Structure 1
């Protein structure tokens, strides 16, 4: 299936929401460092949101690894896919969003015939 990996420990799974992204609709959830002279979030007061730190960096052996244990690889056509012929134990293909539904059945035709896992085999089905 996939090569053995150490058990995934994300070390921080809650997304870092920008401070006051809830309070103000103009402030988007995307993280921005609060560079204020007085902001409690910057000063790391107790009881305030955690800021992204390099400490939270995930294990190098398990970076960009899906919970299944594969590095997802965004694939467009059959030619892109057949580069995983000799990498199926690590890379799980992912059909690009813009691939038409007719072309998906041929992409999964090769992926099934090559034993390469596909992250989204159920997208743009015909039913």
Structure 2
């Protein structure tokens, strides 16, 4: 696709305050709530908090580096819905689909012209 140049806005992960100091407090983002907190009051130098401005360009949203939207395919029927959107969606084979089944999803997607985001999954030579 002659896609627009995808602007990422904020590439760093939004970690949680103090998720580094304590092993109990986790990297999963949670707002700070104490009114004596500096993070909540966004003093200089302190960690960047997720606000709505970091929101991605609606034209480019969901678009992966390939410039395709990710899409999970379970079986060879589900794949063949994108028969029409090869230029736009990328057949992510789903993680639990076996070896014996995958090799079959790859047969079709190659034939149809669907770019599979995850080939070589379980599969060897």
TM category, shorter: over 0.9
Q: What is the number of residues matched between the two proteins?
A: 125
Give 5+ residue unaligned stretches, structure 2: none
Q: Point out 4+ residue stretches in structure 1 off by more than 3 angstroms.
A: none
Tell me, in whole angstroms, the C-alpha distance in 1 between the residues paired with 2:2 and 2:59.
11
The answer for unaligned runs of 5 or more in structure 1 is none
Q: CA shift at 1:4, angstroms?
A: 2.1
RMSD: 0.8
The offset of 1:123, in angstroms, is: 1.0
CA offset at residue 29 of structure 1? 0.3
Contact 1:64/1:72 (CA < 8 Å) preserved in 2? yes
Q: Is the CA contact (8 Å cut-off) linking 1:84 and 1:91 kept in structure 2?
A: yes
C-alpha displacement of 1:77: 0.3
Under a length normalisation based on structure 2, what TM-score does the superposition of the two structures give? 0.97
CA contact (8 A) 1:73 1:94 kept: yes
Contact 1:5/1:61 (<8 A) preserved:
no
Q: Is the 8 A contact 1:78 1:107 kept in 2?
A: yes
CA shift at 1:126, angstroms?
Answer: 3.1
TM-score between the two structures when normalised by the length of structure 1 = 0.96
